[PDB]
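Hallway conversation turned thread

IA: we were arguing at lunch whether anyone had actually written out G protein/GFP fusion protein end to end. Turns out nobody had. So, for the record, here is the sequence (229 residues) and right after it the structure tokens. Reply here if something looks off.
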Amino acid sequence: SKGEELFTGVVPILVELDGDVNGHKFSVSGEGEGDATYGKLTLKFICTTGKLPVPWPTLVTTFLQCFARYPDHMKQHDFFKSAMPEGYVQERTIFFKDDGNYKTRAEVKFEGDTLVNRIELKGIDFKEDGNILGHKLEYNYNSHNVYIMADKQKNGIKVNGKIRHNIEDGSVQLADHYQQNTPIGDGPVLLPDNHYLSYQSALSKDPNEKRDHMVLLEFVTAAGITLGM
């Protein structure tokens, strides 16, 4: 398909985000590449406006599900590639249990041979010494599944995952991500049966890097539709 041959290989990625959380402003610029063939994703992010006012792991989901490896029997349930290269708009809220929420709009689309994710994010009503503004999260990440269902009421999909953020006292901060993907092009797109993406994420630091930054690797495989009985 038009959108499908775009992901036979490695694909350069660019990410740009401008943020407000409780009236502290910041920007993040991201570089890396994706390989939908493996289900791999590799990025380096940098806070260009100084120190990040929130823990890095709280932005991982905000920051490319087109790079998910869909199995053979499920290729016709891949909304994400089907909508390339004109792309999709992602509207989403992340609710942190017993704390504030992130509201963010983003546009994913090809800008040349590069996939570009332009993000806008606002946050309000965060506890000034909660797990987030307190910077109390471990710098790591856990397996999570992301549930996908058709929203043909609007030619799009709805997507929800519950994220587990480990805190330094052995407590867990929960984050509920609800998102809506709606195509930009008017071309026909794939509306999938119910399924999920199996996420694994690993965060690290570049030793040769002076700026507040995060190295993020993700592994994303579509699952949830069996063959036969």
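OS: looked through it. The two ends are 28 Å apart (CA to CA).
IA: good, adding that to the notes. The longest strand covers residues 10-21.
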